[PDB]
Design a protein around this ligand. Structure first.
Ligand SMILES: *CC(=O)NCCNS(=O)(=O)c1cccc2c(N(C)C)cccc12
Ligand SMILES: CCCCCCCCOCCOCCOCCOCCO
Ligand SMILES: CCCCCCCCOCCOCCOCCOCCO
Ligand SMILES: CCCCCCCCOCCOCCOCCOCCO
Ligand SMILES: CCCCCCCCOCCOCCOCCOCCO
Length: 262
């Protein structure tokens, strides 16, 4: 069929600093898509501190794609390669993550749709060092009302939960529930998505713990020649000042190149 390829890169920054460069490549033909990525995370002022890398391979299969009903499945693999500095015990660790994730999209109306994905994760190796729960489920699922070709609203429920198959561990065991709202606007070559996340409930073993809000803004531009760029800002908080975990800032820049064959 037609071979569709993308290459791209991104740089993300977080603080209350973390610098996070990443690269990716994906390739698609008929129902099959394969994706490779490399991500790294560590202090802005690398003094210096703990960092890690995150090579990843994902494969996607589209079972069905049409107006009334679409569904597909992702399988993935990550290694998390940790390089500890200043911390009695270890110096490096490797933890793998295995992912199986169905996705779906079903029409309820000419303007209303039900869509989502669900993910099942296993984490293997060096879990004692790294603190993770060995099992995890993640889902974002909900409704999309389309106003017109320019504007759509999406309101999703989001759950992530951590479990331990090894019933003698509570390491990395948490729960998080959110409502997440988006308003993707398409304005010629410009894309703008305002988004919100409202904590419904969260508990974890590091307490985290009550009402956690995020507001953000994605800006995208397509040059109509294969190239596109992205810029995103996000602000997260608990309730500031005393509250408990107050403020967090996120900024990200990306470039994608899209080219085809056949
Ligand atoms: C406010 C907001 O983020 N809205 C959704 C963005 N949609 S997108 O264009 O697919 C996009 C762009 C850049 C990053 C994105 C992430 N990241 C976790 C970085 C996640 C989903 C979409 C997305
Ligand atoms: C096969 C042609 C691809 C050409 C793409 C060039 C630039 C984009 O890079 C995408 C590759 O993605 C990362 C690959 O996986 C990294 C493996 O890291 C292992 C380190 O231990
Ligand atoms: O622990 C050792 C490694 O085990 C990895 C196998 O787990 C794969 C999880 O299954 C995903 C799809 O079946
Ligand atoms: C602006 C987002 C609301 C889109 C609602 C789409 C419903 C179209 O079918 C008509 C159903 O009539 C019942 C009204 O339900 C409205 C839902 O609540 C409105 C937003 O709070
Ligand atoms: C752009 C349209 C967006 C409108 C939909 C927003 C819906 C947000 O709903 C959030 C519901 O929050 C419930 C709060 O949950 C905590 C309840 O208190 C329990 C503790 O006793």
């Amino acid at each position: 069929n037609d071979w569709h390829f993308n290459i791209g890169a991104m740089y993300e920054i977080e603080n209350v600093g973390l610098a996070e460069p990443s690269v990716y490549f994906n390739a698609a033909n008929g129902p099959w898509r394969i994706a490779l990525a490399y991500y790294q995370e560590g202090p802005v002022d690398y003094k210096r501190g703990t960092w890690f890398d995150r090579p990843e391979l994902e494969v996607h299969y589209q079972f069905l794609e049409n107006d009334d009903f679409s569904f597909g499945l992702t399988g993935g693999f990550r290694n998390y390669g940790y390089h500890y500095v200043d911390e009695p015990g270890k110096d490096t660790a490797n933890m793998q993550r295995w992912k199986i994730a169905p996705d779906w999209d079903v029409k309820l109306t000419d303007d209303l749709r039900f869509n989502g994905w669900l993910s099942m994760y296993k984490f293997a190796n060096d879990l004692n060092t790294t603190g993770y729960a060995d099992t995890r489920v993640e889902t974002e699922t909900g409704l999309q009302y389309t106003f017109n070709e320019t504007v759509a609203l999406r309101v999703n429920y989001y759950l992530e939960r951590g479990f331990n198959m090894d019933d003698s561990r509570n390491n990395g065991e948490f729960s998080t529930q959110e409502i997440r709202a988006y308003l993707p606007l398409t304005l010629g070559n410009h894309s703008v998505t305002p988004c919100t996340r409202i904590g419904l409930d969260r508990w974890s073993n590091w307490d985290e713990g009550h009402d956690f809000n995020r507001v953000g803004l994605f800006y995208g531009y397509d040059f109509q020649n294969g190239l596109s760029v992205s810029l995103e800002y996000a602000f997260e908080w608990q309730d500031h000042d005393e509250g408990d975990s107050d403020k967090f800032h996120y900024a990200g820049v990306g470039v994608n190149y899209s080219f085809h064959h056949h």
